Design brief:
The structure is a homodimer.
Chain A (H helix, E strand, L loop, with lengths): L10 H4 L1 H8 L8 H16 L10 E8 L5 E4 L10 E8 L8 E8 L10 H17 L3 E5 L17 E6 L2 E11 L1 H10 L5 E7 L4 E8 L8 H17 L5 E5 L3 E2 L1 H8 L2 E5 L4 E2 L3 H8 L7 H5 L1 H7 L4 E3 L2 H12 L35 H6 L18 E3 L7 E8 L2 E8 L4 E5 L11 E5 L3 E2 L1 H15 L6 E4 L4 E2 L3 H5 L2 H14 L4 E5 L4 E3 H5 L10 E6 L3 E3 L3 H8 L2 H7 L4 H4 L8 H13 L4 H6 L5 E3 L4 H23 L7 H9 L11 H22 L6
Parallel strand pairs in A: 4-5, 5-10, 10-12, 11-13, 12-14, 17-21, 20-22, 21-23, 23-25, 24-26, 25-27
Antiparallel strand pairs in A: 1-2, 1-3, 3-4, 6-7, 7-9, 8-9, 15-16, 16-17, 18-19
Helix pairs in contact in A: 3-11, 4-6, 6-7, 13-15, 17-20, 22-23, 22-24
The complex binds ligand B38 (2 copies).
Protein name (chains A, B): Acetyl-CoA carboxylase
Subunit structure (chains A, B): Homodimer.
Subcellular location (chains A, B): Cytoplasm; Endoplasmic reticulum membrane
Chain lengths: 693, 693
C-alpha cells in the first residue's frame, strides 16, 4: 500500500488495474463514466450556471453478457471484467434532452492483455453495436488497444523435436519438426491432442509423429482473431449509416483498432496517442534500417488530424469526452427522432452584424458565429457560441461544423477566402525528400477540400440526421495538372453523390461577397436533390459559367470593342484613338458582370429568392422551421397511405391548410402546423382507412 | 462538291456536318450506330467465325421528343437535330443474347454549337437517362463537347451607353451603363424589354435608363445552363446505381462533360481526346504566365488513365465502341436479369495448368487467364480469352477485370506480386518540381490500390450486378508515414463498405503462393457480409496476424531459444555453444509458420474449405453455379411471402430438396434445381396464399 496516510482510500491500490492504465497514460476504463458525468455537468453549467443538478441526472449501468450471451445491466466492482472489452449504458439529462437521452460507451480495457482484440472482445463489441443499433441510440467507442491478439501453442514449445539432417552438426539444416510418443502422451494426458496435426513415420530407430500443422489449445492466436476483426469492421461500417457513431482515441489504437476509428467516421484523437496500422519497430525491422523513431511519426495527430481521419484533437481524455458530449448536443436522442432544438439568449429575431466586404480580407467564421470587436460583439448568421468546427486540421479551404439557427441545429459548410499554406512534412524513409509547401487559393476546390465537403455532407446525414446550409462561394475546381492528376473529379463527384443521398433539408446560399461559377455550381445545384434542396443568392453575390475576364475573352473580343468605339467621336470620325483600350476593356468586363447578378438568377428560375444578408437569419430561421414541420408531415403521410411521390404528398398536406394560409409565408405555415399537430394527427389516423391492393 | 468522280456519293458533302466532325477528329454523331453495328458484327465473328449474320440482327432507332416532350422513335435524315444532343435505341442480337438485348446511346453533337450543353440538351440527356433507367437498360454516353453553353445579350451590345465621369476624357472611368429612350424603344420594338433591368434617372439634359442587370432574350447564356448541368450530374449519379453506365470520350469533354465522365464511373478515353475542367489557355491567362501548352497536359490519357478516371484508352472511336460492346458482354441485358452465361470451348471440366511457385516471379494474369508457352497454352483458372482487364493504367499493384468461369461472368480481383515503378511526372506550374518514382511493393495495399479495389467491387455490384472472386494475397497495408499521411485507412475502409453493399455472390480465395495477414484479412473476411461472402484457402496458402519474423520477434525471443537449446547436448551439458543462433532462429520461424496453415483455418472455422489450385476451377464452377441458383430462389421467396431473414429463406428452400440431396454437394443441388425450376415455381405460386397482417 502506497502512498500511506492519504485522506481517502487509494483507488490505484484498491484496484491496481487503475494504476496500470495510468502507467500507460490513459484513463482506467471503469473511471470513464465519471468523465461523462463530469462532462455532462459542465454542459449544464455552461448552459445555465444556476441549475440545480443532482446525481440522478446521470446514470451509468455496465452491460455484460448473461449465460445466453444476452446483454444485461449489472453493478459490480471495477476490474471484474473477464474479457478485455467493457461497455456502459448512460442515461443523462442534458439541456437538449432535459428528461434524458441514452447512449452506449464501448471500450477496450488496456490492462486486459494489453487491450488486444480476441474473439470474445470482438463478439462483445459486435453485440454492443447491435444493441445500440436496434435501439437507435449513439455508440461511442473508446479506443485503447494493441490490435488483434496473437500467440503460439505454448504447450508445444517444450515438446517439439527437430529432425536434423546431421545430428551433431545442426548447422546444415533440419527436415521437419516432430513429436515423440511421450510428446503425444503428454498431450493426450492434458486433453490437448487436437493441438497438433501429426503424420506418423518410423525412421530407423523410432516412431516420430511429424508436425504438419500447429493448432493450439488456446483460442485467440491467429486467424480466428482476424475473423472477429472483420466482423466488427463490417458491424461498424453498418452502424455509421444507422446511428450516431463516434470514437475517442486514448491510448494507441492499432490494426483493427485504427480501422474501427476510421469506420465509425467521427474521431477525436488525444494528443500523443497514435492511430497506427503497424508500429515503427516492426516497420524498421522490416526495412533493416531504423527509419522511424516514434509511432507518432506514423499516426500521431500531425498525421491524422492533418489527414482528416481525426476530426478533432484533445489535450487529455476528459477534454475528448467533453468534445463528444458537445458533438452529441446537435444530434437526435435516437434514430429518426427530431433534431434537438436548443434556444439560447441569441434569439432568431435580430439582424446579422458581421458583413464581409470585397475590399477587405475576412475569416468566414465571423460570418458564421460572429466576431469580437473593440466596439463589442458583431453577431454572425448563427447563434452566438453555437459553432462547433470539425475536420479543422485538414483541407482548410473549407470550413465545416455544426451550429444553431434560433436554436435549430444544422450542419454548416463555408469557404475560406484566405490562401492555405499547406505544409507537408518530409518522409523519413526517403533521404531525398524535403518538406513541401502547397499553397491552396481560396474559393477553389482542391481534391482535399472537395473530399472534405462530401465527407461533411455525408457525416451530417448519417446518424446526425441534420439539415444543412452551404455558404457556397467557389470560383471552381483547380483544373490544373497537379490537381487533375490527383483526381479532383473523383472527389468532386462524391459531393454530388452525397447530396443525392441527403435526407433532411438543405439550403444553398451564395453569400454577399460570394460567387459560384462553372464547375462549382454543377456540384451544388438543387436539381441534384429537388426533394431536399433549395438555393438562394445574396443581392451582392455573383454567378454564371465564367468570370467576366473569361466571358470577354470569348464574347467581347478585340474587334467587338472597336465597333464599340463608335461610342467615341475622336474614333467614330475616322473612316472612308486606340489607347482607350484600358477603359473599353473595363467596360466589357462590366457589361459581362451585369449578367452575373441575382436578378438574372431569379429571372431565370435558378434560385428560390434573392436575399439580403442582414435579413438572412430571420428569413432562414422561419424557412428552416417551416421545412422541418412539412417534412414531418410528409413522413407521417408516408408511414401510412403508401405509394405517392413527394410532390403528391406535399400537395395533399398543403391542401389541408386553411384557405387563408399563404402557402409561401414560412412563419405562418409553421405557426399553423404547430398549433394543429394533434388535429393533423386526427386527420392522418382517419386516412388509415386503407383497402389499397 | 469535292472530290468529284467518286464511285458512290460523298457523304461529307451530302451532310457537311459530317465533314465538320471529321475536321475535329471525331466521328459524326449519326455515324456512331454504324460503329456499333460493325462492333457487334465483330463480336459474332470472334465467337463463331461461320455464323450467318443479316442486318436484322441490329437495329438503331433515333429517339426524339415529341410535342409533349415524350421520347419517340423516328427515322430521319442525319443532321436534322434541332438540339445538340442526340440519342438512339439499339436492339442487337449478341452471343450472350442471341434473341437480342437493348440499350441507349446518348451523344453530344460536336457540330451543333460546339457540342455545348444548354438547357435543352441537358433536359434531353436527362429524359434519355430516365428512359433507360425505367426500362432497366444500359446507358452509353458518347462525350464530345465544350461544356456549358455561354453567351451575352447580344441585342444589348449595340444599344448600351456608358455614362462617363468626364465625356471627352474617357480615361478616368465611367459611373454606370445605360439606355436612351431609343434603346428602350428599339427593345420594346422587338418584344425584348425583358432583356434588361433599368432604373430611370434624368441627369441634366435627358432620361437615362440605367442598366441594373442584363438578362437577355436568348436562353442559354449562364446560370440556366449551370442548373441543367447539375440536373444531369445528379441524374448520372443515380443511374450509376441503377443501370449499366458507361461513357466514351471522343473529342474533348469539358466541364460538365468531364463530370459526366466520372459520374457514370466506367469510362474509355480515345487517345488524344482530353477530359478537362478548364482549358490551358484559360488557366494560363489566369496565371499571366504560359504554364501549359496542351489540354492533354491537364486531362489526356496520361492524366486520366494513370488516375483511374479512364478505365481504358482506345486508339480510335471504333476501338472504344468495341471495348464498350465487349464490356457489356459480361453484363445482364437489363437490371435484375441473370448474368449472361457464355460457354466457350474452354469448358469447366479441366484442371488448372499455370501454377505459381515461391521460387519464381509470376504475372498473376497467368493464374487468371493462363499463359502461352513454347510447349503450348497453360490454362489459368478462368475461361481462355475471357479476361477483360479494366483500370489497367492505375494502381497497378491490383489487377482488376471481368472473366468467365465455365461461361459464368464475374468480377475478378487479383494481386500483382511484382514491384510497380509508379513514375509521376513533374508539374509544369512548379519550376522546382521533378518527376518522381514511387516504388510500390507487391502484396501491399497502398492508398491507390485500396481505392482501386473498392472501386472495382463497387463497379461490379452496381449495374454490372456480377458475382465476384477475389484472389486475396496481401501482406497488409503500407503503414509507413507517407502512406498513412496519404490516408490509406480511408481507402481501406471503402473496401469494407463496398463488401457490405454487395448483392451477388462473393468468393474470397487465398491462392497457392499466397497470404493474407493482419490488416489485410480484416477488410475481406466473409463476416463482413455473410449473406453473400465465403472464404477459401489453398493448401499452399499462409495466413495469420503477423508473418513468422513478426511472431518470433514477440513470442520466440532471445531467451526462449536458449531454453530450446536443451535440444542440444553440447549446450545442454553446461549448467551448475551459442552460434547455433542462425539455425535455432530458423527453427522458431518454422514453428510460427506451422500455425499459419490452411489446416488451422479449417480447424478454427474461418474458411469454408481448404482447396487444391489445380482442382479449383471445377470446384468453383459448381459452387458459383449452385450459389446463383439458390440466390434466385431466395429472391423469389422474397418477392412473395414477405418478412424473413436470409437464414430462414434458405432453410425453407433447402427443406424443399429431396431428402437424398446432399445439401453440400454443389453440382447435385444445382442440377436438382435446374431440373425443377418450373416445379418450384408451382410451389412458390402456392405460397402466395398470404393473409399476413
Ligand atoms: C488556381 C485556380 C484558381 C481559380 C480557378 C481555377 C484554378 C480553375 O482552374 C478554374 C477557375 C474557374 C473560373 N475562371 C474563369 O471563369 C475564367 C475562364 C477563362 C478565362 C479566365 C480569365 N480569368 N478567369 C477566367 C478561372 C479558372 O477558377
Ligand atoms: C512496405 C511494406 C511491405 C509489407 C508490409 C508493410 C509495408 C506494412 O507496413 C505491413 C506489413 C504487414 C506484415 N508484417 C509483419 O507481419 C511483421 C510484423 C512485425 C515484424 C516483422 C518483421 N517482418 N515482418 C514483420 C510486416 C509489415 O507488410
Amino acid at each position: 500500500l502506497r502512498p500511506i496516510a492519504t485522506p481517502y482510500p487509494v483507488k490505484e491500490w484498491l484496484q491496481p488495474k487503475r494504476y496500470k492504465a495510468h502507467l500507460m497514460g490513459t484513463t482506467y476504463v471503469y473511471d470513464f463514466p465519471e468523465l461523462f458525468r463530469q462532462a455532462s455537468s459542465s454542459q449544464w453549467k455552461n448552459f445555465s450556471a444556476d441549475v440545480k443538478l443532482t446525481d440522478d441526472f446521470f446514470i451509468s449501468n455496465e452491460l455484460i453478457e448473461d449465460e445466453n450471451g444476452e446483454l444485461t445491466e449489472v453493478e459490480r466492482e471495477p476490474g471484474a471484467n473477464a474479457i478485455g472489452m467493457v461497455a456502459f449504458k448512460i442515461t443523462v439529462k442534458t439541456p437538449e434532452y432535459p428528461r434524458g437521452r441514452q447512449f452506449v460507451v464501448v471500450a477496450n480495457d488496456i490492462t486486459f492483455k494489453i487491450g488486444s482484440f480476441g474473439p470474445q472482445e470482438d463478439e462483445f463489441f459486435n453485440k454492443v453495436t447491435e444493441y445500440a443499433r436496434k435501439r437507435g441510440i449513439p455508440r461511442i467507442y473508446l479506443a485503447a488497444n494493441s490490435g488483434a491478439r496473437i500467440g503460439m501453442a505454448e504447450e508445444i514449445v517444450p515438446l517439439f523435436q527437430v529432425a536434423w539432417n546431421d545430428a551433431a552438426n545442426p548447422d546444415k539444416g533440419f527436415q521437419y519438426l516432430y513429436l515423440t510418443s511421450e510428446g503425444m502422451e503428454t498431450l493426450k494426458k492434458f486433453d490437448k491432442e487436437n493441438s497438433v496435426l501429426t503424420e506418423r513415420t518410423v525412421i530407423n530407430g523410432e516412431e516420430r509423429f511429424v508436425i504438419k500443422t500447429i493448432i493450439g489449445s488456446e483460442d485467440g492466436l491467429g486467424v480466428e482473431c482476424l475473423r472477429g476483426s472483420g466482423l466488427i469492421a463490417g458491424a461498424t461500417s453498418r452502424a455509421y449509416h444507422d446511428i450516431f457513431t463516434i470514437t475517442l482515441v486514448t491510448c494507441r489504437s492499432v490494426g483493427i483498432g485504427a480501422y474501427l476509428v476510421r469506420l465509425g467516421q467521427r474521431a477525436i484523437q488525444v494528443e500523443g496517442q497514435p492511430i497506427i496500422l503497424t508500429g515503427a519497430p516492426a516497420i524498421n525491422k522490416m526495412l533493416g534500417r531504423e527509419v522511424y523513431t516514434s509511432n507518432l511519426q506514423l499516426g500521431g495527430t500531425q498525421i491524422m488530424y492533418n489527414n482528416g481521419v481525426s476530426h478533432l484533437t484533445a489535450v487529455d481524455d476528459l477534454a475528448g469526452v467533453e468534445k463528444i458530449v458537445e458533438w452529441m448536443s446537435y444530434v437526435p436522442a435516437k434514430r429518426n427522432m427530431p433534431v434537438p432544438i436548443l434556444e439560447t439568449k441569441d434569439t432568431w429575431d435580430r439582424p446579422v452584424d458581421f458583413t464581409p466586404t470585397n475590399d477587405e480580407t475576412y475569416d468566414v467564421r465571423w460570418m458564421i458565429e460572429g466576431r469580437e470587436t473593440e466596439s463589442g460583439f458583431e453577431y454572425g448568421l448563427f447563434d452566438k457560441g453555437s459553432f462547433f468546427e470539425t475536420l479543422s486540421g485538414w483541407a482548410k479551404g473549407v470550413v465545416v461544423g455544426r451550429a444553431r439557427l434560433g436554436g435549430i441545429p444544422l450542419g454548416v459548410i463555408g469557404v475560406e477566402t484566405r490562401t492555405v499554406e499547406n505544409l507537408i512534412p518530409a518522409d523519413p524513409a526517403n533521404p531525398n525528400s524535403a518538406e513541401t509547401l502547397i499553397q491552396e487559393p481560396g474559393q477553389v476546390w482542391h481534391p482535399n477540400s472537395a473530399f472534405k465537403t462530401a465527407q461533411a455532407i455525408n457525416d451530417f446525414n448519417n446518424g446526425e440526421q441534420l439539415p444543412m446550409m452551404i455558404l457556397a462561394n467557389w470560383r471552381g475546381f483547380s483544373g490544373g495538372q497537379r490537381d487533375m492528376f490527383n483526381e479532383v473529379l473523383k472527389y468532386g463527384s462524391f459531393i454530388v453523390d452525397a447530396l443525392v443521398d441527403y435526407k433532411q433539408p438543405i439550403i444553398i446560399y451564395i453569400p454577399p461577397t460570394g460567387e459560384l461559377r462553372g464547375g462549382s455550381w454543377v456540384v451544388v445545384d438543387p436539381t441534384i436533390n429537388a426533394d431536399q434542396m433549395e438555393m438562394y443568392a445574396d443581392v451582392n453575390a455573383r454567378a454564371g459559367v465564367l468570370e467576366p475576364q473569361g466571358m470577354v475573352g470569348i464574347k467581347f473580343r478585340r474587334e467587338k470593342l472597336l465597333d464599340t468605339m463608335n461610342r467615341l467621336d475622336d474614333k467614330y470620325r475616322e473612316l472612308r484613338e486606340r489607347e482607350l483600350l484600358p477603359i473599353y476593356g473595363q467596360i466589357s468586363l462590366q457589361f459581362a458582370d451585369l449578367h452575373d447578378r441575382s436578378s438574372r438568377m431569379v429571372a431565370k428560375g435558378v434560385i428560390s429568392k434573392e436575399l439580403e444578408w442582414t435579413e438572412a437569419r430571420r428569413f432562414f430561421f422561419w424557412r428552416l422551421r417551416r421545412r422541418l414541420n412539412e417534412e414531418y408531415l410528409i413522413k407521417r403521410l408516408s408511414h401510412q397511405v403508401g405509394e405517392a411521390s413527394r410532390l403528391e404528398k406535399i400537395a395533399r398536406i398543403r391542401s389541408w391548410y386553411p384557405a387563408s394560409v399563404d402557402h409561401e409565408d414560412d412563419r405562418q405555415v409553421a405557426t399553423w402546423i404547430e398549433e394543429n399537430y394533434k388535429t393533423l394527427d386526427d386527420k392522418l389516423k382517419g386516412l388509415k382507412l386503407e383497402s389499397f391492393a
